């Protein structure tokens, strides 16, 4: 809900993209989960996706001050066979 997606077909590679709202001219550090229970900036990339790819993934951005941090999710739903 409010989720944006991705969809990739299977085998081939994705650049999944961080959608936390951040600031430019911060030189951010970047770490992403799958929650379980390219020119674009801090995306992860996930090579030869399947099927158990798919789920929901979290990337947390942290700016280097170590005060402060962004979230943001998206979904990566793999669907060639």
Do not use: F, H, M
């Not at 990739?8 to 770490?31: G, I, K, M, N, R």
């Not at 992860?44 to 996706?49: E, F, M, S």
């Amino acid at each position: 809900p409010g989720t944006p997606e991705v969809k990739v077909a299977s085998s081939e590679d994705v650049d999944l993209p961080c959608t936390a709202p951040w600031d430019p001219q911060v030189p951010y550090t970047v770490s992403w989960v799958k929650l379980l229970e390219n020119e674009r900036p801090y995306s992860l990339k996930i090579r030869n996706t399947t099927s158990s790819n798919s789920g929901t993934y979290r990337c947390t951005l942290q700016d280097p001050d170590g005060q402060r941090n962004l979230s943001g999710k998206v979904i990566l739903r793999v669907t060639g066979s």
